Design a protein around this ligand. Structure first.
Ligand SMILES: CCCCCCCCCCCCCCCCCC(=O)OC[C@H](COP(=O)([O-])OCC(O)COP(=O)([O-])OC[C@@H](COC(=O)CCCCCCCCCCCCCCCCC)OC(=O)CCCCCCCCCCCCCCCCC)OC(=O)CCCCCCCCCCCCCCCCC
Ligand SMILES: CCCCCCCCCCCCCCCCCC(=O)OC[C@H](COP(=O)([O-])OCC(O)COP(=O)([O-])OC[C@@H](COC(=O)CCCCCCCCCCCCCCCCC)OC(=O)CCCCCCCCCCCCCCCCC)OC(=O)CCCCCCCCCCCCCCCCC
Ligand SMILES: CCCCCCCCCCCCCCCCCC(=O)OC[C@H](COP(=O)([O-])OCC(O)COP(=O)([O-])OC[C@@H](COC(=O)CCCCCCCCCCCCCCCCC)OC(=O)CCCCCCCCCCCCCCCCC)OC(=O)CCCCCCCCCCCCCCCCC
Ligand SMILES: CCCCCCCCCCCCCCCCCC(=O)OC[C@H](COP(=O)([O-])OCC[N+](C)(C)C)OC(=O)CCCCCCCCCCCCCCCCC
Ligand SMILES: CCCCCCCCCCCCCCCCCC(=O)OC[C@H](COP(=O)(O)OCCN)OC(=O)CCCCCCCCCCCCCCCCC
Ligand SMILES: CCCCCCCCCCCCCCCCCC(=O)OC[C@H](COP(=O)(O)OCCN)OC(=O)CCCCCCCCCCCCCCCCC
Ligand SMILES: CCCCCCCCCCCCCCCCCC(=O)OC[C@H](COP(=O)(O)OCCN)OC(=O)CCCCCCCCCCCCCCCCC
Ligand SMILES: CCCCCCCCCCCCCCCCCC(=O)OC[C@H](COP(=O)(O)OCCN)OC(=O)CCCCCCCCCCCCCCCCC
Ligand SMILES: CCCCCCCCCCCC(=O)OC[C@H](COP(=O)(O)OCC[N+](C)(C)C)OC(=O)CCCCCCCCCCC
Lengths: 175, 96, 83, 347, 115, 98, 171, 51, 88, 99
């Protein structure tokens, strides 16, 4: 149904993580982290945060593009592997799927699964707020606050990024 | 040119925000009666669904405090129409 | 005085794009300090009524707080209209 | 590496450590750890040889994994308490994750395998930053969350470190792995007394830092990274052989030397809480540490090992290295026992 | 909902065209037709051998710079704050550091591709 | 905790277990580190958005910033690993303690 | 922990205002000046009580002024107004700026027929004081008694007796 | 304490630098013709590329 | 652990086994002292192919000058011993 | 903090984001503002050991407003009972809930 869009997207979210966690060739591993990046952007979006959802998807699209260019250089062999071409990758891929299937089965039937934490299967929609906000996006206001409120966060983040450039220039210089 | 028009646009926004402010007291009053009407309807029906359960105090709170606690989506729309709930929860996010 | 116009003219003939970058960047960091309308910018932001203006309880000693939205008391946006 | 870049990178490591120490927000504490880890790798790879690359690769993987666990604990704590304060955690599951995360960064067993390896693959100076300055931040977080740390978890790690640390170093001839395992064993004493009295954790950490720093400085003076190499020092700097003897004896906890103070004060606190068996086991188990410290003295100071003919050429040159703070550190690392009651200043 | 339908329609249309492409034409398959194309002669070695990246250092920098847009895209909303003096200072501070990052890599031959 | 939190925490564990169990490629184990960041990002975003913790809305953004300072750092070592050996196999990093 | 006390369906019933949103937007500026008192008195109750059930009575008086407000427009400016809000309703953003002509016809009719004066820019945003006989609520959060604090330590400092008293040290 | 396993372990290099390895990676080889727009039809230009 | 040491009896099995796999030598009359050319009838190239198998067997390079003299299985076993210093 | 420099220098570096009842942009309140305020005001100064026992109610209420476990269990019980009664033709849906 439609009331369970977030739960369905989260199931697909886990399936992508089982995807690249099996560690096929990073070409397919990068594909899995892009699929989960997209649906992960959907889940956040359905909770109200559209800027956050688009940001993570956008940032991971760029990052996984650099990984692709590196895979053809440092992480490639004559016969790249798929989820079917190894027993280790196949055994791990089917393992994670069954463990997700049994969680979806018990939560949707029992309505209460306790594994470390207690989880409730009534439906994600039961916790949403009822009232409306004002004439603005609440999450947008908070992200804008980074500059008026987060002065200390900007300074460290800006400094860390600047050193990040310097650091990789030293590491990769070689000789 | 761009600055004057933008400056004109800040004044238009204020005239738009003030009109909202003149209406909020009426919308607050309407929203209150709407929630309370729905909380009672959920309470009234629960009385006919837990009429036999031995250990059950109808309409009992779950908090120790007696303060007013704003109801969550599950409470307010307990058993309303399926499509009514979907637009209540994802109506704004999905409306484009 | 003879070497300042020799570095500038050397870069302008080799790095015209960089000259336009530093020159543009400099005005962004300087002009806001020197502008007289920068104060108005901050005042217009405070003038945008996002929240509801919750009223006050009249204790009887608040002559600076208006009794009606159309009273002389209280801040006015007259400066905004003429701006 | 350009000398300007070395300082800025060093100042970022300290800034990462200092941010963790002054922060009152679980987000900044994580940022501090990330900033520290960012600027520590280049110092390992300041020479660009295959062993530095392996050490940096192994060091990056371990700390980044630890950081994911520490951030995961911070999020679970946010859900169950709705606040970011750097104080006691509000969920048993988050405390376990944070404790393991911090134990991974410190190198406490069983998450210890990297410490012998990273130190061996990096210069002596780099190892000094890895085994002294990199404990300040992980320790300043245990100091603030010890009330919520599980008792059985923390003590188990300490009993494993003192055992793994003691046995591991028996088999080593490299000086950078003897100090790697000496570090692990000393982490056990620091975290064993944390549940009972955090003040004694600081004292054990301060004495450990001085003795460790003194050891590395004297190794750097002669450029010695093996047991045999250190055996020729009696033919170059005989005064340096005696200082190594005194420092090594102190590190073993022998009285009346400073290295006995942290052990002495730790036993007191545990006994006052009716913990008799554990300090006894820790004290006896520390004889393993003293044994492989005594082999260094036998090969270094108490006997004269064979030399080489070309050694005669070194007699004619002075020791040109900085050896900064060495004369002060050597004194503080042997002759502080009479000033034991000064530990109250740490409170 | 409306977005979902549009997404489902665009990709369904493309899939049908792919299905039609493979099932409408008359086919004639044999080994020499499906071999890899390298200008008429057989390729020497697999296309899966390593392919050197002469701009690896520029690629890594892209990650770090590509984050600045995450921290910079809020600026249109940030300008609406009442504390414009602080917000203005940090917005320029953040952008200025990005330029200093670029100028450091530029001078250090970072942007120059290797050989 | 709603049924969504189960999948995001289930996803984090899958990435965590994936990271700890290396196969051969170092790049394959770098993705799992980036995968864990995505789980934590989503889990924080759901928690912060749901409770209307307005100022905390900047936390997930800051998280991504250092999420990529590791990826950049992680790829930097991978370049240096393959230069020495020609491939990013982890079995070649066995000079230390052996 | 007790039953949640809610009003009956009879206690929440009132003559409702059934004019679409385009109508309210077009008539909000005159509504924000004529019905200021009955509903500024309501919002103060609502904020201070922090309980929908404690300000229902004030809520009914908001609908009263709102209804009587429209009856006045319906009896004098019925036609010029219906032209006004119809134009606003046409747009999807319900923009004021595209209906300034019809606004003048509506402002002049109310001004002449009813004497209403439109608020000036920045008026409805002001913070106003409202006189109410309703007592100021005590403990609106229904908070229990806070725990008593730890006793304070007082007295001039004196040096420790016999020193540190650490094993054998005499100082 | 030598064992069965650690019999073959060798002392690390005096200066910590291990010998560089032999030929590892070969340049990609590509046929730039003869059926190429820029090969003038009849030029099989066999190239060895590094990237 | 340290692998078992090479012994002159161990080498002998390897050589004969390698020769046994060869399809031109008749297994019946292949003695440790039999001659490749005269006894087994192999030609020059047939002899060169056998020496190539021995390189694969023990994994080391044999120069052409030496292989010109390995005319019977015995000296092969001798030659392998001389390279691995298997005096036994 | 290990070194409470902020208190010494009187500079707020990160305490503005520690709690969700702090000042927010445009005075936007959080969903559990009222409960977090009471727990913090109950437990101020007495210390953590006491607040673990004397302010236990105000913290259980807060923990309910966050995860709503005690609330979802109640709803879960009603749904279970309702689907049972409606399974054997014994529950008549009220008009508004459906129609
Ligand atoms: C407890 C209290 C006792 C604490 C003991 C502190 C002393 C440690 C032993 C000193 C060892 C020594 O003599 O230096 C040789 C040694 C030289 O190494 P090298 O391999 O021959 O060459 C280094 C570069 O390659 C050379 O690069 P370059 O040639 O291109 O030029 C760059 C220059 C750079 O010069 C600098 O060192 C810059 C100074 C930075 C410190 C700033 C202080 C705060 C402001 O090189 C140097 O490193 C100068 C020589 C080292 C002098 C260091 C004097 C300060 C040390 C004491 C302060 C400790 C603060 C923590 C250190 C940072 C932690 C990550 O110096 C070091 O590298 C060790 C640095 C110190 C790390 C240990 C810090 C102790 C942590 C516990 C602190 C407790 C609080
Ligand atoms: C708080 C107040 C503490 C006052 C401390 C004042 C002394 C520190 C400054 C000494 C200095 O410049 O070098 C330190 C230090 C040099 O390291 P070093 O290897 O120990 O110097 C020995 C040479 O003989 C260094 O001597 P030199 O032959 O190179 O030249 C003579 C040197 C004379 O410098 C000296 O006398 C070096 C010895 C001074 C004492 C250094 C240890 C710090 C003393 C405080 C710690 C006491 C231990 C804690 C107490 C525990 C007991 C409860 O002249 C000066 O440096 C004038 C300093 C006044 C400016 O500089 C740095 O590491 C960078 C900072
Ligand atoms: C050092 C520890 C022993 C080492 C031996 C090895 C033992 C290792 C195991 C450690 C066992 C635990 C620690 C020891 C047990 C202490 C337990 C205790 O209750 O402490 C009470 C102890 C005394 O309390 P008390 O019983 O109420 O009063 C003692 C008397 O009434 C007297 O007090 P007073 O106030 O009436 O008169 C003070 C008296 C000083 O007090 C004493 O000397 C005798 C008091 C000792 C108490 C009995 C302890 C047993 C050990 C005896 C040590 C013999 C010290 C004399 C050595 C020959 C020098 C005359 O005379 C003065 O020196 C005048 C004041 C000088 C002020 C200096 C101003 C700054 C300038 C500093 C310049 C430094 C010199 C530069 C060098 C230039 C050379 C050209 O206070 C302490 O906690 C301090 C502990 C450390 C003792 C230091 C005493 C000597 C100070 C001068 C250093 C001379 C070298 C010392 C040998 C070190 C070589 C490695
Ligand atoms: C049931 C199996 C028997 C069905 C009969 C059959 O094989 O026909 C399928 C036929 C026979 O398979 P085919 O591969 O021989 O058809 C290929 C197309 N021709 C014949 C023109 C070269 O295949 C088709 O599905 C028809 C192809 C056109 C469909 C294009 C629109 C797709 C939407
Ligand atoms: C709860 C579920 C617990 C996890 C169970 C998942 C089992 C995963 C194993 C999948 C099959 C497999 O990986 O092969 C058997 C494996 C040996 O690995 P394998 O690659 O097959 O080596 C020989 C072939 N080269 O054998 C193993 O190593 C088993 C390791 C577990
Ligand atoms: C089967 C099964 O239920 O095993 C659960 C096992 C024991 O945990 P538990 O069920 O809480 O013990 C009984 C308490 N009444 O617990 C487990 O084995 C679960 C192992 C989880 C992996 C923990 C690694 C750290 C990750 C922490 C994030 C949260 C993981 C839990 C949520 C994922 C599953 C939904
Ligand atoms: C309140 C805060 C505001 C201040 C912000 C402070 C940060 C400023 C820098 C931020 C931007 C990052 C760039 C910093 C590096 C400057 C550029 C540089 O480093 O050039 C070095 C250059 C190396 O190239 P080279 O191989 O030597 O070729 C030339 C041969 N001589 O060798 C050279 O040629 C160097 C020549 C000197 C470079 C001078 C650069 C001047 C920059 C400021 C110009 C501002 C003035 C214009 C604006 C005023 C308004 C119009
Ligand atoms: C419910 C809450 C709990 C949630 C648990 C999440 C875990 C579910 C499974 C998701 C996938 C886990 C990642 C897969 C691990 C992996 O990558 O395997 C690597 C390793 C590779 O070994 P390899 O060198 O290729 O040779 C094999 C020869 N035996 O593989 C091997 O060595 C052998 C194959 C192992 C595959 C089975 C292991 C997966 C199950 C681990 C559960 C741990 C608990
Ligand atoms: C390896 C695959 C992963 C496991 C998938 C689970 C399959 C078994 C389900 C049996 C129990 C059950 O009934 O659960 C079905 C659930 C819930 O669906 P719902 O719409 O809330 O149905 C109930 C509500 N109704 C009655 C109104 C419709 O399905 C899911 O949303 C899980 C995701 C679907 C698969 C997406 C990936 C393709």
């Amino acid at each position: 149904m439609m009331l369970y869009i977030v739960f369905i997207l989260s199931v697909i979210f886990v399936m992508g993580f089982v995807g690249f966690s099996s560690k096929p060739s990073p070409i397919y591993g990068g594909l899995g982290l892009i699929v989960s990046g997209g649906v992960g952007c959907g889940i956040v979006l359905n909770f109200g945060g559209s800027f956050l959802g688009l940001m993570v998807f956008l940032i991971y699209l760029g990052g996984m593009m650099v990984v692709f260019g590196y895979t053809t250089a440092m992480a490639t062999e004559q016969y790249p592997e798929i989820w079917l071409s190894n027993k280790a990758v196949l055994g791990a891929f089917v393992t994670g799927l069954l463990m997700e299937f049994f969680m979806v089965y018990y939560v949707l039937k029992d309505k209460e699964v306790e594994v470390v934490f207690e989880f409730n299967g009534l439906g994600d929609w039961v916790i949403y707020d009822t009232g409306d906000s004002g004439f603005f996006s609440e999450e947008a206001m908070g992200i804008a606050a980074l500059y008026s409120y987060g002065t200390w966060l900007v300074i460290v983040t800006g400094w860390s990024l600047l050193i990040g450039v310097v650091v990789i220039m030293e590491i990769t210089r070689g000789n | 040119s761009m600055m004057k028009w933008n400056r004109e646009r800040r004044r238009l926004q204020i005239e738009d925000f003030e009109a909202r402010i003149a209406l909020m007291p009426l919308l607050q009053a309407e929203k209150d009666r709407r929630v309370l009407q729905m909380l009672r309807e959920n309470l009234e029906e629960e009385a006919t669904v837990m009429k036999d359960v031995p250990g059950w105090k109808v309409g009992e709170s779950v908090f120790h405090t007696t303060r007013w606690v704003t109801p969550m989506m599950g409470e307010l729309y307990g058993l309303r129409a399926s499509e009514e709930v979907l637009s209540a929860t994802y109506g704004f996010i999905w409306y484009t | 005085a003879e070497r300042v116009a020799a570095f500038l003219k050397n870069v302008w003939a080799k790095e015209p794009v960089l000259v336009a970058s530093f020159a543009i960047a400099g005005l962004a960091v300087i002009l806001p300090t020197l502008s007289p309308y920068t104060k108005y910018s901050l005042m217009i932001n405070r003038a945008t009524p996002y929240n509801y203006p919750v009223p006050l309880r009249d204790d009887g000693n608040m002559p600076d707080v208006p009794s009606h939205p159309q009273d002389p008391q209280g801040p006015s946006l007259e400066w905004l209209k003429r701006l | 590496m350009n000398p300007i870049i070395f300082i800025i990178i060093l100042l970022t490591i300290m800034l990462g450590t200092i941010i963790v120490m002054i922060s009152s927000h679980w987000l900044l504490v994580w940022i501090g750890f990330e900033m520290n880890m960012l600027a520590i790798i280049p110092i390992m790879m300041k020479n660009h040889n295959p062993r530095a690359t392996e050490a940096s690769t192994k060091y990056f993987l371990t700390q980044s994994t630890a950081s994911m666990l520490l951030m995961m604990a911070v999020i679970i704590n946010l859900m169950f308490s709705g606040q970011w304060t750097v104080m006691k955690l509000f969920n048993p599951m988050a405390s376990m994750l944070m404790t393991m995360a911090l134990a991974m960064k410190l190198g406490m067993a069983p998450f210890h395998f990297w410490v012998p390896e990273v130190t061996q693959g990096i210069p002596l100076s780099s190892g000094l930053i890895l085994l002294t300055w990199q404990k300040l931040a992980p320790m300043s977080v245990l100091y603030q969350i010890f009330p919520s740390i599980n008792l059985n978890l923390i003590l188990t790690l300490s009993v494993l470190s003192i055992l793994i640390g003691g046995w591991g170093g028996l088999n080593q001839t490299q000086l950078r792995k003897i100090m790697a395992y000496s570090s692990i064993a000393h982490m056990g004493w620091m975290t064993a007394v944390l549940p009972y009295n955090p003040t004694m954790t600081l004292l054990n950490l301060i004495i450990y830092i001085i003795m460790t720093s003194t050891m590395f400085t004297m190794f750097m003076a002669n450029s010695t990274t093996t047991t045999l190499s250190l055996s020729h020092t009696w033919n170059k700097t005989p005064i340096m052989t005696v200082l190594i003897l005194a420092t090594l004896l102190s590190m073993g906890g022998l009285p009346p030397l400073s290295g006995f103070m942290p052990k002495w004060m730790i036993i007191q606190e545990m006994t006052k809480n009716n913990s008799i068996i554990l300090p006894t086991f820790m004290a006896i188990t520390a004889l393993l540490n003293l044994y492989f410290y005594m082999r260094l003295t036998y090969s270094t100071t108490l006997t004269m090992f064979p030399s080489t003919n070309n050694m005669k050429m070194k007699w004619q040159f002075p020791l040109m290295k900085k050896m900064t703070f060495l004369p002060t550190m050597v004194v503080l690392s042997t002759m502080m026992l009479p000033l034991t009651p000064m530990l109250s200043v740490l409170e | 909902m409306n977005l979902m339908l549009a997404l489902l329609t665009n990709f369904t249309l493309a899939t049908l065209l792919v299905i039609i492409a493979f099932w409408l034409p008359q086919l004639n398959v044999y080994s020499e037709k499906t071999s890899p194309y390298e200008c008429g002669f057989d390729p020497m070695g697999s296309a899966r051998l390593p392919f050197s990246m002469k701009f690896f250092l520029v690629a890594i920098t892209f990650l770090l710079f590509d984050l600045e847009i995450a921290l910079l895209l809020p600026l249109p909303w940030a300008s609406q704050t009442a504390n414009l003096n602080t917000m203005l200072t940090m917005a320029l501070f953040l952008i200025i550091l990005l330029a200093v990052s670029l100028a450091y890599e530029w001078t250090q031959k970072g942007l120059e591709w290797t050989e | 905790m709603s049924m969504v939190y189960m999948n995001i925490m289930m996803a984090f564990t899958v990435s965590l277990v994936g990271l700890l169990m290396y196969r051969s490629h170092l790049m394959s184990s770098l993705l799992c580190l980036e995968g864990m960041m995505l789980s934590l990002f989503v889990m924080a975003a759901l928690t912060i958005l749901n409770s209307h913790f307005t100022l905390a809305s900047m936390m997930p953004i800051i998280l991504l910033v250092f999420a990529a300072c590791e990826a950049a750092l992680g790829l930097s070592l991978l370049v240096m690993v393959s230069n020495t050996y020609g491939t990013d196999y982890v079995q070649n990093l066995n000079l230390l303690q052996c | 922990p007790g039953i949640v006390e809610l009003p009956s369906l009879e206690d929440l019933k009132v003559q409702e205002v059934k004019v679409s949103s385009s109508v309210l937007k077009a008539a909000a500026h005159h509504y924000g000046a004529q019905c200021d008192k009955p509903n500024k008195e309501f919002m103060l109750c609502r904020w201070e009580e922090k309980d929908p059930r404690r300000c229902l009575e004030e809520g009914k008086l908001v609908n009263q002024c709102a209804l009587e407000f429209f009856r006045q427009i319906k009896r004098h400016c019925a036609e010029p107004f219906t032209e006004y809000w119809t134009c606003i309703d046409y747009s999807g953003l319900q923009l004021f700026r595209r209906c300034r002509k019809q606004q003048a016809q509506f402002d002049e009719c109310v001004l002449d027929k009813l004497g209403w004066v439109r608020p000036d820019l920045g008026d409805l945003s002001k913070v106003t004081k409202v006189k109410t006989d309703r007592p100021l609520p005590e403990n609106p959060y229904h908070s229990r008694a806070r725990p008593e604090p730890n006793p304070e330590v007082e007295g001039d400092l004196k040096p420790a007796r016999h020193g540190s008293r650490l094993f054998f040290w005499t100082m | 304490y030598p064992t069965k396993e650690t019999a073959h372990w060798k002392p690390p290099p005096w200066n910590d630098v291990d010998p560089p390895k032999d030929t590892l990676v070969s340049n990609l080889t590509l046929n730039f013709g003869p059926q190429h727009p820029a090969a003038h039809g009849v030029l099989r230009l066999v190239m060895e590329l590094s990237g | 652990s340290d692998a078992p040491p090479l012994t002159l009896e161990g080498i002998k099995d390897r050589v004969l086994y390698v020769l046994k796999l060869y399809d031109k030598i008749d297994p019946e009359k292949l003695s440790v002292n039999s001659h490749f050319m005269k006894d087994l009838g192999l030609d020059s190239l047939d002899q060169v192919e056998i020496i190539m198998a021995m390189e694969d067997e023990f994994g080391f390079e044999i120069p052409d000058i030496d292989a010109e003299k390995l005319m019977c299985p015995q000296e092969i076993v001798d030659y392998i011993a001389d390279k691995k210093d298997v005096y036994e | 903090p290990f070194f409470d420099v902020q208190k010494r220098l009187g500079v707020d570096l990160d305490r503005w984001m520690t709690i969700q009842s702090a000042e927010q942009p445009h005075k936007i309140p959080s969903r559990c503002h009222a409960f977090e305020k009471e727990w913090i005001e109950c437990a101020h100064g007495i210390g953590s050991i006491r607040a673990e026992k004397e302010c236990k109610i105000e913290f259980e209420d807060f923990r309910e407003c966050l995860l709503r476990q005690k609330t979802m269990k109640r709803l879960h019980a009603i749904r279970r009972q309702r689907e049972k009664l409606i399974k054997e033709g014994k529950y008549t849906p009220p008009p508004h809930h459906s129609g």
